[PDB]
């Protein structure tokens, strides 16, 4: 638990411009965000799942946030009204933001992206498979077996068993 010995990062290191978009603006345009920003998301989630340290790969988290900000600024430069209409139809379509309720504006958004950036929208389940990456960060350590030099010693299988000296050593026996 957090004491004075633990080295938390300073608040000036944590002062990063954040992706402050709503749920409809994150659900819409996600399939073009993931393909454009697959190099940093996989490395950051590998950092989060392998080390399980919140203080580690903070630069990777900053890279993910900056890459998402760069993609949304690129969308803001060219295709703004189409993305706004797509997010509006996605939020007003149903309770949960489901893509199947209106496909009419999704085609216009993909047409705008195909005409401007020449990007192809991926399939429906491209981002839910297993991702294989060539991470530059080395894996930390193999789980070594704990050494117990003084355990409870049993009788070994190779130990010879001569007959007992004067047998059972009971009363009147042997």
């Amino acid at each position: 638990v957090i004491t004075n010995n633990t080295t938390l990062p300073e608040e000036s290191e944590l002062n990063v411009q954040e992706l402050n978009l709503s749920s409809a603006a994150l659900r819409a345009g996600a399939f073009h965000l993931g393909k454009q920003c697959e190099q940093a998301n996989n490395e950051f989630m590998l950092c989060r799942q392998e080390l399980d340290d919140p203080r580690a790969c903070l630069a990777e988290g900053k890279a993910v946030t900056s890459c998402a900000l760069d993609f949304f600024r690129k969308v803001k430069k060219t295709c703004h009204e189409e993305f706004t209409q797509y997010a509006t139809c996605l939020d007003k379509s149903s309770g949960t933001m489901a893509f199947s309720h209106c496909r009419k504006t999704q085609g216009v958004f993909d047409k705008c992206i195909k005409d401007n950036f020449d990007w192809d929208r991926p399939s429906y389940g491209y981002f839910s498979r297993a991702k294989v990456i060539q991470s530059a960060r080395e894996a930390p350590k193999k789980e070594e077996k704990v050494s117990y030099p003084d355990a409870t010693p049993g009788l070994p299988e190779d130990y010879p068993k001569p007959p007992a000296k004067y047998g059972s050593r009971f009363h009147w026996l042997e």
Binding site: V1, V146, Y148, A151, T152
Partner: protein, 100 residues
């Protein structure tokens, strides 16, 4: 865990019923205790393996963390009752709703 008296086929089902091994905040602590109970046994594991026992009990029992939380909350209310802390500064800056 209790050592059963007899090791029959009928302990095979009962043994896995409760255990932190299924995904849990610190079942990896409990494993570090449990293999220790394979090393020294149950009775020498109560003495020679006391440091790994207290970490698992601290983690899942949550004793000293809750005691420290209640010490930090009762001292704040004692400072409120003793007149040191009053007004709108009785409670500090609240965390964000998705902070934890």
């Amino acid at each position: 865990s209790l050592t059963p008296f007899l090791r029959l086929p009928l302990t095979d089902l009962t043994g896995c019923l409760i255990n932190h091994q299924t995904y849990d905040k610190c079942g990896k602590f409990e494993m570090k205790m449990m293999e220790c109970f394979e090393a020294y046994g149950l009775e020498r594991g109560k003495r020679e393996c006391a440091d790994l026992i207290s970490d698992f009990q601290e983690c899942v029992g949550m004793q000293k963390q809750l005691m420290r939380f209640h010490a930090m909350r009762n001292e704040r209310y004692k400072q409120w009752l003793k007149g040191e802390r009053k007004g709108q500064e009785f409670f500090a800056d609240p965390p964000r709703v998705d902070a934890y």
